[PDB]
Structure formats: C-alpha cells, structure tokens
C-alpha cells in the first residue's frame, strides 16, 4: 500500500530535518490544513519543496496547479517564482482556498496566485482556446482522478518544451496493482500510468514520495 | 536502516516498470554488473534515470561522475547529453571500468566518457587549475565517503549557477542516526549532511531512493 515508513520513523524524520527549508507561512498553512477534513490528502512538505526546487531550477515564471485545496502546492510554487511569476490554481470548492488565502497574504505571494474557481477541465480548455499552448513552465496535476487523463493531455500541451508535468498520488495506496472492480478512481490512476509509461513526448521518473509522484519532462 | 522495501517487492516493481526506460546498452551494463561480486554497489536504475533526466532537463553538456565503478552512472549521464557532451568519470580501480567499456561503445558514448583513472580529488584539483570552475552542469558524488566533504566543495565550485550536485548514499544504512565508535565513513556522511543542510549556496532535496539521495541545486 505504501513504499515509505510511518511519518514517526526516526530515519524519515532525519530525512526531513536535514532537508526541509519550509517558509514559515507555508509551514503554518500545512499545520492548519492537517486539521481539516481530507487534510491528509494535501501535498506533503518534501514533495512541495522538490517541485518548488525544480521550478526554481528551470527559472519558471508560469505554473499551473490543478486542485488548489487550501493552496499549499500553489503557495510552494508561488514562492519559487520571481516577482512577476504567476500560478494559475484550479479548484471547485470555494471553502478550502479561503482557509489558505490569509497565509498566501502573509507570504506576500497572494498577487502571484491566480485562483480559478471552476472545474479544471474548463480552465484548461480556456487556456488552450486562448492560444496559450507551450507557454507554461510547470504543471501540477492533483485534482480529481476521474479526469486525470484529460488533465495530463491538456497540461502537456500547455507546457513549453523543457517544462515539468507533475502528477501526484499515482500509486493510489497500492490499488494500482489490482484496481477493485468498479473502482473508477483506481482504474483512472492505473490507465494514466500506462499512458505516461508509453508516452514518447516526455521522459519520466516515478518517485516514492507521498502516494507516488510522477515527474514527466516535456521534450 | 532503509526507507524502502526490497527491490523485488510488488509495489516497487510497479514503480520501476511504469517508469524505467534504460537504453539497451545501459540495461545490459546493469545486468552484467549484477553478475559480479559487489555488483549491487552500482546505483539503482531509477536513481541513475532520475539523474540522467535532470541532466537532460537542464540541457547539460558537461557532467562529473565520481566513482565510475563499471560505468553505469557515467553511461546514464552520457546518454542524456548531446553529441559534443562530456562526462568526466573518476575511479581508482582500473578493473571495473574495463567491464563497462564495451557497453559504452555499444551506446555510441565512448567519445563522451572521459575516464580519469586516479583519485577523484586529484582530478577535481586539475579541472579547477585548468580554469573549469563554474562550467559543469551536473556532478554525481558516489565515490569513497572519506573524502566526500572535499568532493562536495570542489564539485560545487566546478558547477555553474543552476547546476545539480547529487550526493549518493547519504543515509549510510541508517548509521547517520548515531555513527558507531570508530566508524569514520558514517561520521563523514553525517558531517556532510549537516553542512549541506545549512548551506546557503544551494537549495536542496533529500529523496528516499537507494541509500538516500541528496540533490543540491547551485544558486
Ligand atoms: C488532493 S487535493 C489537492 C491538494 C493540494 N494540491 C495541496 O497542495 O494540498 C484535491 C483537490 O482537487 C479538488 N477537485 C476535485 N475535482 C476538481 C475539479 N474538477 N477541478 C478542480 N479541482 C477539483 C478537490 O476539491 C480538492 O481540493
Ligand atoms: C558505489 S561505487 C560507484 C557506483 C557507480 N556510481 C554506479 O552508479 O554504478 C564507488 C566507487 O568509488 C570508487 N572509489 C573509491 N575511492 C575513490 C577515489 N578516491 N577516487 C575515485 N573513485 C574512488 C570505488 O573504487 C568504487 O568503484
């Protein structure tokens, strides 16, 4: 079900303590988020830092974040971007982003975070119909699993060559090994993994962080 | 001791099968190396692939590979570079590179791989004396632990801004937690981790691959 030990593992704690450089506002947002219903679905701190580091590495200016929740990944990305950077973040529930907004403000990153409260598929299609193919530097796919294939295809088209497409929670607690009959979400995660496996448009790494992290680098 | 389950476990095999894209020669090099005593000293295939992927991502042209062994990481890196790319690979033991060379040839990568048969510290000093500071794109530190702090510093100097410095085996089978008395290598690993943790010259991720993998991105 899970490749890594419990969070309380001493070796895991050492990994975190010897690597984490979490912004105070980001840290405050995480601790708040963990008290919320579905707080355990949030992006983990070391995943967010890896993605922010990669965004910084490639000098990203334009990021796309699917599944805002409380805005943890959006804020992590925003902090990796220069002053004129923008994160377009997509969500359907208005409540969770409003929990994170005060922390976006504290981090002086609220102006960098562009919240689009509508289904992600709608925002993706709009961006493309506006002719914004090949303009995004980083895309994070962490919304619903039902539409994740459509999300992957659209994010890939929105990324420039050399862009980074991250898909979160790709092992689905080990259910990808044999998705239960009628488990739409699990079948969807499994189907996308197969597609990405075959995709010659990208080169890829699958990492044992969180519930599995795919990094697909666009050619 | 380990953050990860055994390599042959079901979920790990899934992660590999859904991500791995070794060039046939690179695959053959791995399999051949694994027929040798201590063959599993080679870095795992997904670590080499992550490193090769990040090299490609940043359009690397020059790489440093400390601890050639049979040439697995050297070849992985070479395959991520353009025709005129170069990997300076450093090794003290003449025998293992002889094993890998036929696979370097099979991969059309011999002209890209620059083998320096002598202590890595000597090669690093030579490159710096030659005016190569700030010109390498990727540096992989996978030799002896006794000199790993010296390797880190020299590699950091040799890397350009935006370069990637990878340190392998940073958890040292959990001995970093409390290095046993007289365990000089474990103390060396522990000491470097504290320096990197504090190091303002880089931004960092520590990943639960192999025996721990540190990625330090140069500012
Ligand atoms: C796993 S959470 C995202 C975690 C978040 N990225 C973080 O950093 O903590 C999944 C989010 O996707 C949202 N979501 C579900 N369907 C969506 C859709 N069609 N479009 C956009 N967001 C959606 C959920 O409401 C939820 O907040
Ligand atoms: C863990 S193996 C490297 C594995 C290789 N990176 C791979 O991916 O397959 C460590 C290597 O460092 C070499 N080594 C030991 N001391 C060295 C030194 N002072 N300079 C260069 N290489 C050294 C060893 O002989 C050994 O081949």
From Swiss-Prot, chains A, B:
It is found in: Membrane. Homodimer. The keyword Membrane applies. It is an enzyme of class 2 (transferase). The chain holds residues 44 to 262 of 262 of the full protein. One of its GO terms (molecular function) is S-adenosylmethionine-dependent methyltransferase activity. Keywords: Membrane, Methyltransferase, S-adenosyl-L-methionine, Signal-anchor, Transferase, Transmembrane, Transmembrane helix. This is Catechol O-methyltransferase domain-containing protein 1. S-adenosyl-L-methionine binds at residues 65, 67-68, 73, 91-92, 120, 142, 144, 151. Its main location: membrane. One of its GO terms (biological process) is methylation. Belongs to the class I-like SAM-binding methyltransferase superfamily. Cation-dependent O-methyltransferase family. Putative O-methyltransferase. It comes from Homo sapiens (Human). It is a single-pass type II membrane protein. Its EC number is 2.1.1.-. GO terms for cellular component: membrane; mitochondrion.
């Amino acid at each position: 079900q899970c490749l890594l030990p419990p969070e309380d593992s001493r070796l895991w704690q050492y990994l975190l303590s010897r690597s984490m450089r979490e912004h105070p506002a980001l840290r405050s947002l995480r601790l708040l988020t963990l008290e919320q219903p579905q707080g355990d679905s949030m992006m983990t701190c070391e995943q967010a830092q890896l993605l922010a580091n990669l965004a910084r590495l490639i000098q990203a200016k334009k990021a796309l974040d699917l599944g805002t929740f409380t805005g943890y990944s959006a804020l992590a990305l925003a902090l990796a971007l220069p002053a004129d950077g923008r994160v377009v973040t997509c969500e359907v529930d208005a409540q969770p982003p409003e929990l994170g907004r005060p922390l976006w403000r504290q981090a002086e990153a609220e102006h960098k975070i562009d919240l689009r409260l509508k289904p992600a598929l709608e925002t993706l299609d709009e961006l493309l119909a506006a002719g914004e193919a090949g303009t995004f530097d980083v895309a994070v796919v962490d919304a619903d699993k039902e539409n994740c294939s459509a999300y992957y295809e659209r994010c890939l088209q929105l990324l420039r060559p050399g862009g980074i497409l991250a898909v979160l929670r790709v092992l689905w607690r080990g259910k990808v090994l044999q998705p239960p009959k009628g488990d739409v979400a699990a079948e969807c995660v499994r189907n996308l993994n197969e597609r990405i496996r075959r995709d010659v448009r990208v080169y890829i790494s699958l990492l044992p962080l969180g519930d599995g992290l795919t990094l697909a680098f666009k050619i």
